[PDB]
Amino acid sequence: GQTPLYRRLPRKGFSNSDYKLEYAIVNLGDIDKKFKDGQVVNYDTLLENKLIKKKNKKIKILSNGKLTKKVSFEVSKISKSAESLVIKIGCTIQLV
Amino acid sequence: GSSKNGRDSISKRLGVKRSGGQFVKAGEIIVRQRGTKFHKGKNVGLGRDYTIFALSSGKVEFKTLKGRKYVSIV
Amino acid sequence: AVELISLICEETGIRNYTTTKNRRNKQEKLELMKYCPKLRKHTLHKEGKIK
RNA sequence: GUCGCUGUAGCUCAGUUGGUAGAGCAUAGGACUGAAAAUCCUUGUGUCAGGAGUUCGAUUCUCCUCGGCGACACCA
RNA sequence: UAAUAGAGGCGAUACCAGGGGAAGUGAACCAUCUAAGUACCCUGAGGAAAAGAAAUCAAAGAGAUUCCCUUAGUAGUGGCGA
RNA sequence: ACCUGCGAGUUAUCAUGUCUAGCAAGAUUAAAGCAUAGAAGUGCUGGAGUCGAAGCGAAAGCGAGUCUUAAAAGGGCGAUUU
RNA sequence: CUCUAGUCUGUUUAAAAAGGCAGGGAUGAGCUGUGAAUAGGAGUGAAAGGCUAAACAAACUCGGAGAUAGCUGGUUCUCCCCGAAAUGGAUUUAAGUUCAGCCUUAUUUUAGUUUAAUAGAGGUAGAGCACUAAUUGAGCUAGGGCCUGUCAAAGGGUACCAAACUCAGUUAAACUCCGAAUGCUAUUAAAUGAUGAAUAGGAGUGAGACUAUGGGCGAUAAGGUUCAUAGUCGAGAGGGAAAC
RNA sequence: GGGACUGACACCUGCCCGGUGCUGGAAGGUUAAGAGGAGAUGUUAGUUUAUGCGAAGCAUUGAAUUUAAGCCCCAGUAAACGGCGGCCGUAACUAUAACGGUCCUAAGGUAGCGAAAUUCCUUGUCGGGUAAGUUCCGACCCGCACGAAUGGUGUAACGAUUU
RNA sequence: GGGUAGUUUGACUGGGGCGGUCGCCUCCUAAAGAGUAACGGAGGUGCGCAAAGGUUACCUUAGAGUGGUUGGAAAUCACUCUGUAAGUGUAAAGGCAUAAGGUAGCUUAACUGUAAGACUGACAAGUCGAACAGAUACGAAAGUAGGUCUUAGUGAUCUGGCGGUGGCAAGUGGAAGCGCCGUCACUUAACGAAUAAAAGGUACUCCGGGGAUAACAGGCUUAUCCUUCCCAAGAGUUCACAUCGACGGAAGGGUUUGGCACCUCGAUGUCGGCUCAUCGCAUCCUAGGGCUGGAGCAGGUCCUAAGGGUAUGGCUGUUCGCCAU
RNA sequence: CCCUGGUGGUUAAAGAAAAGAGGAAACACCUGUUAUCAUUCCGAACACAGAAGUUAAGCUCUUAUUCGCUGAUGGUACUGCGAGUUCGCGGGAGAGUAGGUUAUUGCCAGGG
Structure with a gap:
């Protein structure tokens, strides 16, 4: 009969579902561990190499682990730290 | 003829919190009191x-x- | 006989502060040098309504 | 919160689409009756709640407030 | 009146469509809400019934209806209480 | 009343913890289809989906950082040590 | 022929409302046969909350239905290890529930607990009148009235009514210039050996009772009521207090 | 013909319309839907260097004006539901108070009855009945807390009623 | 619009009702850390202040005595002693001379973003806080100021209003709306707030339970009640005690009215009368005594003694009581 | 170094009262209000300007401890624990009594 905790506390806002841009994270360490020079890291190759699942098609590239191999990228978003490191190693970046 | 009174406040838990000779670090409360x-x-x-x-x-x-x-x- | 007034930044018009003031004691138009966080600078705030 | 309004003599009430400050009651004085009453007569009783503007001048005209209103809608 | 044709009632304490439609309860009361379009009643049929060939979905480019798997206990909704 | 029988934490799903078994930054199919025989099996096929792999914030957005604010200046939540 | 005042029997009755003595009406608002009509929130009622199939302050049967119960009762084989609580907070709560406290299992961690020594803060017991009040007897003496050279001028006799002050002597949970013993906290050294703590799974409990001290209320009555410390019972068999 | 209350008969049935009902009455105060669209808002062809403004169309809205009953309001009605007071002083002893003053209300209980199927104190007080009567009968009135169609006070006859 | 329908109508409580109370603050109870209950003992409170806040600088009351126009016990002025007893908006407590008290000048820190570390704590919450960036007030400066000497003057969530920001914007661009920041509206006072919206009767009652809880009895207790006893001022012509003994003091009895709620509510039948009794002695009669203010008769008081006996009627349901014999 | 003045440290009052002593320097009294400064009136205080005079007061020192303050040793109250019971072990006031007490000290400036 005491007012429960979830009724003493207030609410905070909407959930913004139905409008999320949800999409898969892939890290530089993963790319280093799985790929090699010269091919195009993109939807098709990450899907067949089992870094993502073909439900999502808007990949983002994050910067955990280190990458050493010159590669070409065809992705949808990229973090500033990751693209700096990747340009420094000498790859190429096309945003799709 | 009921009782005219019966009313008390919540005890405030005053007194010395750290005893003389104990080691404290910055910001500790030592005494809670009303007045010096x-x-x-x-x-x-x-x-x-x-x-x-x-x-x-x-x-x-x-x-x-x-x-x-x-x-x-000290 | 005490009402909740609001102190308004003169140069922006934002209602930055709210305070209490006793009516029927001064019925003047209280002015206070208050710090207006929009400008990062103190300025003049005037009494005004709440609602 | 909103709507319809008022505040003018001690009380009640006029107040004229802007140039009056009064009407009735009461107060005080004279007269009358044996007094109390009732005539009759005189006589005071105002920033016309405050301010700004309209007018050549504003109780009045408008607006902004002050205090008091009647009535209506919400009220976690 | 005449002429034909088809109906009437039962079964199936099952299923289906339409019409009417509760309350015991839960919300530790209770009135919104819940139970629930459930129980029951009534009218119609069938071997299935109903629905069905977009004045549809919905931001994907699909292409009638119906029944499973998932989306998902998510989006929303609620004295934002249950 | 005595004696003898009957007479009470079960089942289906979801949440979470433990044990066992397998695989492993991956784990796993659901509905369903074919083959076989009639033998409500078991063998393949089925990756649609679900849970992990990145978090913070109301959210946009940015991401091993992010939110609060001009301030990593200090904190809240993170973490590099799965 | 119809009804039942009074009384008795009956009362595990012959009878799920009768029987024996009797009593009221008995040409009428009478009694009765055979049909029919009015149905559940409705009927009927010369009015009693009466009657409607022996049950009526809302009939019976079936269905919702295995309705809901913070309430009562019941819940079946064995052994080993550990082992409570009846308190605090909140509550349309006081016989309920929930969190904390107390228990258990698993992992991790290592530092409770009792002394001794040193060093700390109280205001209790006790005591005291220095503060706030109460109060005893003398001394002193304002002030008030009594009496007297009286006007009511200035006066004088003071049995007293008595402030303040002095000496002596008392009272206090809401008085304190003072003030322990135990208890509490910190450190160290010994002593005891998993009794501490963190995370996670599962709880139960939240009606207590008496005894030894300190109290409040009561009537320094209660096996009374309400708190604090410890013990026992609770959950503890055995010996003693004759039983207990 | 329906409803309400009272209940043969005899004598009677007093006062109060404030409260709440019922009946009648609209002068106002207030008031819904419907009409009425002051004005405000979103969109944009265009204008504006552009914002801003922004015609028309399409939408979301809303005030002033109009408006019924009801309520407030104005009366009537008690054989409508109901109500029907206190204090103080006063005479050729003592006692009481015919009388007077005062406060308040819509009005303050008239006739009759009264320790009653009503009276707590109470087994009130006096008389009758009994050798002895908390019951009974006849009165007194200090009616805790009677009272006039929820009828008041009586009444011949009647009662498986009570005393 | 009770014609009809669905419901509400609190809890604590030495049973319940009636009454009182419900949040917060101060003191005592509280047993010298903290905490600690009762329908235990005393109070306050739902604010006030534009200064009665911030800062700088300077000052010190009340009381007693004393000298003074009215002026008196006491107004204002001066001195002595006393040394906070005064005064701090508001209850009380703890504090307050460096004053937190009094006065004056300037002024708005009655600030934005934060906050190491803590106190108290079931939780929700509440409280203290050095120091840092921005920008002020006072001060020469050091520094102080994030309201008030401190502790009460308060109210969760949901819903809605107002201002700002421009985050979300159901195809796109807007917009309605929402989110964010600032902020307003609850005697939700039963004050951790069951609804936006709520009073009674049941003796016509019913069901589930309780001796967790009352009425009749048993038990504990003895305030009250009853029976004595201690002290003896007195009354009694004188003479405390022949007799009565006031004012007080100490006990027992368990019968009266009560207190407590320990047994019993899946039942312990309640007042009188009838019938039948049995026991106690604190003795009404009969029996044996002591003393008398006992001439005799008849008594008064006290002691021993329970063998037997201890009336019929009127009124009332009555026990009781009155009345007649 | 000592005196004087200033400024601290260690706390038991380092408290006031009365009497006596001095004053070279130092301190203070004291003098004038005119300039800047101050009082809810007053040069009292504060502030500025100075050297006529004095221990009178303040200040330092010396006194009977006159008031205050402090105060043992024993004993008592009280108290933790205890199979000793008004007893066994340990802790131990307040009041009173005998007393005591008119501080001590660091480093800066002046000159002894």
């Missing part, structure tokens, strides 16, 4: 409600001068 039952000595400060707190790490000590008790950090 204990006054401030070296390296302590007084809050707006006369709380005694430690401005630096050290060991609490109580001194007496002219019958008044002073709290210090």
Whole structure:
């Protein structure tokens, strides 16, 4: 009969579902561990190499682990730290 | 003819929180009180409600001068 | 006989502060030098309504 | 919160689409009856709640407030 | 009146469509809400019934209806209480 | 009343913890289809989906950082140590 | 022929409302046969909350239905290890529930607990009148009235009514110039050996009772009521207090 | 013909319309839907260097004006539901108070009855009945807390009623 | 619009009802850390202040005595002694001379973003806080100021209003709306707030339970009640005690009215009368005594003694009581 | 170094009262209000300007401890624990009594 905790506390806002841009994270360490020079890291190759699942098609590239191999990228978003490191190693970046 | 009274406030838990000779670090509360039952000595400060707190790490000590008790950090 | 007034930044018009003031004691137009956080600078605030 | 309004003599009430400050009651004085009453007569009783503007001048005209209103809608 | 044709009632304490439609309860009361379009009643049929060939979905480019798997206990909704 | 029988934490799903078994930054299919025989099996096929792999914030957005604010200046939540 | 005042029997009755003595009406608002009509929130009622199939302050049967119960009762084989609580907070709560406290299992962690020594803060017991009040007897003496050279001028006799002051002597949970013993906190050294703590799974409990001290209320009555410390029972068999 | 209350008969049935009902009456105060669209808002062809403004169309809205009953309001009605007071002083002893003053209300209980199927104190007080009567009968009135169609006071006859 | 329908109508409580109370603050109870209950003992409170806040600087009351126009016990002025007893908006407590008290000048820190570390704590919450960036007030400066000497003056969530920001914007661009920041509206006072919206009767009652809880009895207790006893001022012509003994003091009895709620509510039948009794002695009669203010008769008081006996009627349901014999 | 003045440290009052002593320097009294400064009137205080005079007061020192303050040793109250019971072990006031007490000290400036 005491007012429960979830009724003493207030609410905070909407959930913004139905409008999320949800999409898969892939890290530089993963790319280093799985790929090699010269091919195009993109939807098709990450899907067949089992870094993502073909439900999502808007990949983002994050910067955990280190990458050493010159590669070409065809992705949808990229973090500033990751693209700096990747340009420094000498790859190429096309945003799709 | 019922009782005209029966009314008491919540106990406020005053008193000395760290005993003389104990080791405290900066910001500790030492005494909670109404009024300067204990006054401030070296390296302590007084809050707006006369709380005694430690401005630096050290060991609490109580001194007496002219019958008044002073709290210090040494 | 005490009402909740609001202190308004002169040069922006934002209702930065709210305070209490006793009507029927001054019925003047209280002015207070208050710090207006929009400008990072103190300025003049005037009494005004709440609702 | 909103709507319809008022505040003018001690009380009640006019107040004219702007150039009056009064009407009735009461107060005080004279007269009358044996007094109390009732005539009759005189006589005071105002920033016309405050301010700004309209007018050549504003109780009045508008607006902004002050205090008091009647009535209506919400009220976690 | 005449002429034909088809109906009437039962079964199936099952299923289906339409019409009417509760309350015991839960919300530790209770009135919104819940139970629930459930129980029951009534009218119609069938071997299935109903629905069905977009004045549809919905931001994907699909292409009638119906029944499973998932989306998902998510989006929303609620004295934002249950 | 005595004696003898009957007479009470079960089942289906979801949440979470433990044990066992397998695989492993991956784990796993659901509905369903074919083959076989009639033998409500078991063998393949089925990756649609679900849970992990990145978090913070109301959210945009940015991401091993992010939110609060001009301030990593200090904190809240993170973490590099799965 | 119809009804039942009074009384008795009956009362595990012959009878799920009768029987024996009797009593009231008995040409009428009478009694009775055979049909028919009015149905559940409705009927009927010369009015009793009466009657409607022996049950009526809302009939019976079936269905919702295995309705809901913070309430009562019941819940079946064995052994080993550990082992409570009846408190605090909140509550349309006081016989309920929930969190904390107390228990258990698993992992991790290592530092409770009792002394001794040193050093700390109280205001209790006790005591005291220095503060706030109460109060005893003398001394002193304002002030008030009594009496007297009286006007009511300035006066004088003071049995008293008595402030303040002095000496002596008392009272106090809401008085304190003072003030222990135990208890509490910090450190160290010994002593005891998993009794501490963190995370996670599962709880139960939240009606207590008496005894030895300190109290409040009561009537320094209660096996009374309400708190604090410890013990026992609770959950503890055995010996003693004759039983207990 | 329906409803309400009272209940043969005899004598009677007093006062109060404030409260709440019922009946009648609209002068106002207030008031819904419907009409009425002051004005405000979103969109944009265009204008504006552009914002801003922004015609028309399409939408979301809303005030002033109009408006019924009801309520407030104005009366009537008690054989409508109901109500029907206190204090103080006063005479050729003592006692009481015919009388007077005062406060308040819509009005303050008339006739009759009264320790009653009503009276707590109470087994009130006096008389009758009994050798002895908390019951009974006849009165007194200090009616805790009678009272006039929820009828008042009586009444011949009647009662498986009570005393 | 009770014609009809669905419901509400609190809890604590030495049973319940009636009454009182419900949040917060101060003191005592509280047993010298903290905490600690009762329908235990005393009070306050739902604010006030544009200064009665901030800062700088300077000052010190009340009381007693004393000298003074009215002026008196006491107004204002001066001195002595006393040394906070005064005064701090508001209850009380703890504090307050360096004053937190009094006065004056300037002024708005009655600030934005934060906050190491803590106190208290079931939780939700509440409280203190050095120091840092921005920008002020006072001050020469050091420094102080994030309201008030401190502790009460308060109210969760949901819903809605107002201002700002421009985050979300159901195809796109807007917009309605929402989110964010600032902030307003609850005697939700039963004050951790069951609904936006709520009073009674049941003796016509019913069901689930309780001796967790009352009425009749048993038990504990003895305030009250009853029976004595201690002290003896007195009354009694004198003479405390022949007799009565006031004012007080100490006990027992368990019968009266009560207190407590320990047994019993899946039942312990309640007042009188009838019938039948049995026991106690604190003795009404009969029996044996002591003393009398006992001439005799008849008594008064006290002691021993329970063998037997201890009336019929009127009124009332009565026990009781009155009345007649 | 000592005196004087200033400024601290260690706390038991380092408290006031009365009497006596001095004053070279130092301190203070004291003098004028005119300039800047101050009082809810007053040069009292504060402030500025100075050297006529004095221990009178303040100040330092010396006194009977006159008031205050402090105060043992024993004993008592009280108290933790205890199979000793008004007893066994340990802790131990307040009041009173005998007393005591008119501080001590660091480093800066002046000159002894």
